Amino acid sequence: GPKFPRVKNWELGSITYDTLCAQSQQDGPCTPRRCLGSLVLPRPPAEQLLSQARDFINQYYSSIKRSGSQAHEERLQEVEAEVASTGTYHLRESELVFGAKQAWRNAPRCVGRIQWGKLQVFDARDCSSAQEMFTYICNHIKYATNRGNLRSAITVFPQRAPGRGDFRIWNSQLVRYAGYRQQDGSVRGDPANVEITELCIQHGWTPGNGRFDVLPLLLQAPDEAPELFVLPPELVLEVPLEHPTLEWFAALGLRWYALPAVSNMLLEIGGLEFSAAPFSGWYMSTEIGTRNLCDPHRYNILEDVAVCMDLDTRTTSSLWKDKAAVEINLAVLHSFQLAKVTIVDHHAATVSFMKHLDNEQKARGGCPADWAWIVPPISGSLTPVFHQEMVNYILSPAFRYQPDPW
Amino acid sequence: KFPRVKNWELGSITYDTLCAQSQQDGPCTPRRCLGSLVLPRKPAEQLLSQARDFINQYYSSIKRSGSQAHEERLQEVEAEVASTGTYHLRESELVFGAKQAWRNAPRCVGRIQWGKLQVFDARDCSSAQEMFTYICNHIKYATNRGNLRSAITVFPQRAPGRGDFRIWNSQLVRYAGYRQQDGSVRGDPANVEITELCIQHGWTPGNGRFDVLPLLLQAPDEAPELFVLPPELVLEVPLEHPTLEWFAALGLRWYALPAVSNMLLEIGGLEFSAAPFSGWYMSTEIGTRNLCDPHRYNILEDVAVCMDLDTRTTSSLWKDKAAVEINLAVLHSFQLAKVTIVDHHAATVSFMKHLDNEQKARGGCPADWAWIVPPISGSLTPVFHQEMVNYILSPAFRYQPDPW
Numbered sequence: 001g002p003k004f005p006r007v008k009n010w011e012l013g014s015i016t017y018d019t020l021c022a023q024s025q026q027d028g029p030c031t032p033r034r035c036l037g038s039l040v041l042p043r044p045p046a047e048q049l050l051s052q053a054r055d056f057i058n059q060y061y062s063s064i065k066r067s068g069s070q071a072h073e074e075r076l077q078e079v080e081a082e083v084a085s086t087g088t089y090h091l092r093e094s095e096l097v098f099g100a101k102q103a104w105r106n107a108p109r110c111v112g113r114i115q116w117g118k119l120q121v122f123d124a125r126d127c128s129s130a131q132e133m134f135t136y137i138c139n140h141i142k143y144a145t146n147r148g149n150l151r152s153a154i155t156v157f158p159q160r161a162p163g164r165g166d167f168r169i170w171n172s173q174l175v176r177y178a179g180y181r182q183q184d185g186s187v188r189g190d191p192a193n194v195e196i197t198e199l200c201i202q203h204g205w206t207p208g209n210g211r212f213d214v215l216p217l218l219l220q221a222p223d224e225a226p227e228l229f230v231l232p233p234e235l236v237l238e239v240p241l242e243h244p245t246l247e248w249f250a251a252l253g254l255r256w257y258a259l260p261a262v263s264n265m266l267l268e269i270g271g272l273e274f275s276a277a278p279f280s281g282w283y284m285s286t287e288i289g290t291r292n293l294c295d296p297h298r299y300n301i302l303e304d305v306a307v308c309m310d311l312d313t314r315t316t317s318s319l320w321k322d323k324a325a326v327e328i329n330l331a332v333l334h335s336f337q338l339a340k341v342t343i344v345d346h347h348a349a350t351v352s353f354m355k356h357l358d359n360e361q362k363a364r365g366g367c368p369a370d371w372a373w374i375v376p377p378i379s380g381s382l383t384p385v386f387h388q389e390m391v392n393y394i395l396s397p398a399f400r401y402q403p404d405p406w
Numbered sequence: 407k408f409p410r411v412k413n414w415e416l417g418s419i420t421y422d423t424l425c426a427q428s429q430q431d432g433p434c435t436p437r438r439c440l441g442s443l444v445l446p447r448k449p450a451e452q453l454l455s456q457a458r459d460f461i462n463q464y465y466s467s468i469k470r471s472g473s474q475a476h477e478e479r480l481q482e483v484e485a486e487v488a489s490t491g492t493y494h495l496r497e498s499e500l501v502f503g504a505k506q507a508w509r510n511a512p513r514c515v516g517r518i519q520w521g522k523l524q525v526f527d528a529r530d531c532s533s534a535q536e537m538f539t540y541i542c543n544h545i546k547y548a549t550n551r552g553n554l555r556s557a558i559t560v561f562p563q564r565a566p567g568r569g570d571f572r573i574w575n576s577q578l579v580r581y582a583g584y585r586q587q588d589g590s591v592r593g594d595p596a597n598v599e600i601t602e603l604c605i606q607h608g609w610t611p612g613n614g615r616f617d618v619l620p621l622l623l624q625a626p627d628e629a630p631e632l633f634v635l636p637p638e639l640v641l642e643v644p645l646e647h648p649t650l651e652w653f654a655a656l657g658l659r660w661y662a663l664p665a666v667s668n669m670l671l672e673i674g675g676l677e678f679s680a681a682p683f684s685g686w687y688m689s690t691e692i693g694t695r696n697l698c699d700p701h702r703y704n705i706l707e708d709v710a711v712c713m714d715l716d717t718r719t720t721s722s723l724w725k726d727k728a729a730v731e732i733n734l735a736v737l738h739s740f741q742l743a744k745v746t747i748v749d750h751h752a753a754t755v756s757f758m759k760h761l762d763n764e765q766k767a768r769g770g771c772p773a774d775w776a777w778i779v780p781p782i783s784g785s786l787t788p789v790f791h792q793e794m795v796n797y798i799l800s801p802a803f804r805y806q807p808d809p810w
């Protein structure tokens with residue numbers, strides 16, 4: 001009937017339609033000929049900018065119920081005149097707040113979006129040095145960590161400016177363990193971070209040799225080389241991993257940090273580009289227990305734990321991988337709880353995201369969602385989102401990926 | 407144009423150029439991706455074009471392209487469509503087509519096996535009774551006392567203005583789902599509609615959780631007929647856990663033969679509306695989906711209580727623990743009963759190998775990531791970390807409306 005994507009939940013039998021997708025301005029990677037949905041990273045003119053700026057201003061006035069108003073039309077003339085003279089324009093404070101929240105809300109790969117309204121936005125568009133970026137970041141970490149009672153936050157630094165260098169945080173997260181390529185070809189620490197480790201070295205960091213060494217920050221102010229800042233340890237809250245009944249698990253000496261703070265994503269709002277705008281939430285347990293600790297190309301501790309558990313690792317059909325993986329996820333949850341550090345398991349998360357989808361069905365007529373990223377990397381069909389069809393598309397405001405500064 | 411496909415565990419990159427041979431639209435557009443939808447939303451030069459292409463494929467497959475036999479076959483097909491609006495396949499072509507359809511199936515994790523498929527031509531079938539006989543033979547062959555073998559039986563093609571040969575059942579072996587009026591369901595809830603159709607067509611129902619249904623076979627433009635499968639034809643495996651002696655007491659069992667019977671087989675424009683095929687199970691299908699899915703037998707909590715776990719909360723991963731033991735139970739049981747089965751680790755490991763064979767052979771391989779990654783332990787398998795391109799090649803298995 002409706003000229004919109006019919007969406008089905010196969011557990012409950014319920015149908016919805018997505019009308020929100022009709023608001024999408026940007027093409028994704030798919031075509032009638034092939035679906036490229038499983039690719040991680042698939043491949044201004046004042047006219048262009050203005051149309052984006054206008055669209056965002058309309059989104060904004062809509063959210064405060066003043067679409068059509070004198071303040072709405074005036075704001076548009078203001079933005080247009082601003083672009084007409086400077087090539088760019090600037091956002092008001094509450095516009096930046098609404099956009100930051102809307103970029104999160106629009107993020108198709110994020111299962112934590114039920115929280116999208118509770119996002120603390122720190123304005124740091126006054127920042128003029130790399131030392132200043134460090135203070136803001138430290139403040140963010142302090143506020144967001146909150147002694148283990150975690151709080152979603154983002155800190156926004158100056159936007160891209162015509163003929164001027166970006167503000168860039170070089171690291172992909174604010175907190176990252178070092179990756180040390182060994183002489184025997186192997187890697188000590190986190191293999192994910194070999195390149196950022198070597199970059200920190202080339203820039204004069206005296207490197208450690210642990211499995212869990214916190215990297216310094218490489219902060220870059222416009223038209224200047226990156227400077228190096230070492231985070232004070234007490235600011236970086238960590239959780240030692242023990243298991244609730246496997247007494248030896250604590251002896252493995254594994255740990256993870258409390259705060260997931262992504263720092264290399266571009267925040268786009270109304271055609272304005274914020275190249276440095278780190279944000280943080282809290283972890284879902286499988287991020288640590290499954291991806292970071294058990295990916296072959298990460299810590300890859302699955303065999304280790306499996307041996308300690310005395311499993312038959314010579315054969316797939318023992319499900320020793322599945323067994324070990326559970327106990328690692330359980331230990332992540334148990335330790336974070338014990339340490340009173342905010343964390344959510346993948347059942348509780350996906351349940352909360354089903355409620356999110358229902359909220360947005362009413363609120364906006366749909367929700368852009370990446371099924372491959374929303375389903376957890378363990379126990380997939382045991383969570384309710386596995387049985388939920390999803391429609392994926394790009395809305396703006398948006399968190400976008402951006403090429404590495406070097 | 408050509409997609410860059412990356413494996414994120416190994417850093418390896420391929421380029422799918424096989425996709426450029428796709429003549430059929432998928433659900434996606436540049437504006438929104440609809441990859442997660444389970445089903446699709448909804449002259450004679452057309453048929454002749456698909457007909458030539460397939461013939462072209464066939465004669466290339468046997469390295470005999472441009473030959474006299476190739477040229478003659480094209481004229482035969484062309485002459486037959488011109489005169490009758492349709493044509494027929496030679497058995498050898500059919501064998502080829504059916505294999506290519508399996509090979510092209512983007513959702514199938516078991517395609518390493520594609521070239522090894524026993525094809526039964528049943529296009530000379532003319533009644534429900536004959537359909538039944540062909541089905542019994544397929545089951546006997548394919549089951550092979552537990553050493554499962556992959557077979558397809560192909561019934562007569564659809565014809566303009568005539569009913570289709572159909573098997574109403576989705577699989578040749580389904581368990582009855584009896585709707586107890588108190589909301590609940592006894593048996594497999596996935597099979598409520600089909601179980602009702604059977605009773606209204608005169609089947610005497612049971613009152614059990616694992617009651618094998620009869621088949622409803624329909625010869626064209628006739629009411630479907632009811633056929634009970636001889637109990638000895640339906641091989642089944644009682645489930646017991648290797649260390650939890652209390653598991654067998656749950657009275658759990660599953661059948662050995664996964665035979666899908668409601669998909670349409672399309673080869674060279676011709677359509678085969680009844681072409682049940684079968685292989686062997688991947689353990690997670692039974693252990694995770696069929697037994698643990700909420701809208702199926704839904705045994706997770708039950709098992710979890712007998713393991714004395716904390717149902718009170720999610721953070722205890724009781725669901726994940728119970729599921730792992732259920733999957734273990736299934737693998738153990740089947741291996742103990744000497745019935746063919748593949749775990750999700752072995753299966754995805756062979757699929758990787760398959761993608762590689764395919765990359766060398768055709769320059770790509772259509773794969774549905776959401777369907778290739780198993781329902782548990784996703785990232786613990788190599789296919790999770792592999793990018794995939796999805797598209798529609800022909801010959802192809804398709805979905806089709808239920809014939810009622």
Ligand code: HEM
Pocket residue numbers: 100103104107109110111112113115119152153154279280281282283284287344349373399
């Ligand atoms: C509040 C608790 C949160 C939870 C539990 C959560 C959970 C997750 C998880 C598990 C992922 C998958 C990422 C991966 O596997 O690499 C994700 C993705 C994402 N999250 Fe959230 N998130 C939270 C908060 C936030 C916040 C505050 C923001 C920004 C304002 C945000 C923005 C995003 C974006 C843009 C992605 C896409 C990842 C990418 O494309 O690289 N999330 N989230």
Ligand code: HEM
Pocket residue numbers: 508511513514515516517519523556557558683684685686687688691748753777803
């Ligand atoms: C030999 C062992 C085989 C294994 C282990 C296997 C495995 C699987 C699995 C696990 C699925 C996912 C199904 C689901 O979860 O609903 C699937 C799908 C599929 N398989 Fe295979 N398969 C095998 C043989 C075959 C054969 C012989 C054929 C046909 C000739 C075939 C054709 C298909 C098709 C068309 C799908 C798509 C399912 C759908 O969308 O309904 N497979 N396979």
Ligand SMILES: N#Cc1ccc(CCNCc2ccc3ccc(N)nc3c2)cc1
Pocket residue numbers: 040041112260262280281282283284287
């Ligand atoms: N190249 C590359 C490449 C590598 C990893 C990713 C995924 C990184 N996502 C990390 C991420 C981002 C935001 C998050 C928000 C909350 C949370 N708990 N985890 C979060 C995790 C994408 C591209």
Ligand SMILES: N#Cc1ccc(CCNCc2ccc3ccc(N)nc3c2)cc1
Pocket residue numbers: 444445516664666684685686687688691
């Ligand atoms: N409507 C609907 C609808 C519901 C479920 C499915 C999935 C059916 N696929 C089952 C299936 C198909 C082929 C298989 C081949 C081998 C195997 N071991 N299992 C197999 C299982 C499709 C459409």
Ligand SMILES: C[C@H](O)[C@H](O)[C@H]1CNc2nc(N)[nH]c(=O)c2N1
Pocket residue numbers: 038039040372373374414790791792793794
């Ligand atoms: C190849 C595949 O697209 C890739 O590994 C994806 C799959 N799903 C994911 N899902 C989440 N949440 N995070 C990820 O990094 C990925 N990676």
Ligand SMILES: C[C@H](O)[C@H](O)[C@H]1CNc2nc(N)[nH]c(=O)c2N1
Pocket residue numbers: 010386387388389390441442443444776777778
């Ligand atoms: C909506 C979602 O795509 C749907 O549940 C899919 C996901 N992946 C699947 N994968 C397999 N193998 N079988 C399935 O039925 C499904 N279901």
Ligand SMILES: [Zn+2]
Pocket residue numbers: 030034035036037434438439440441
């Ligand atoms: Zn797509």
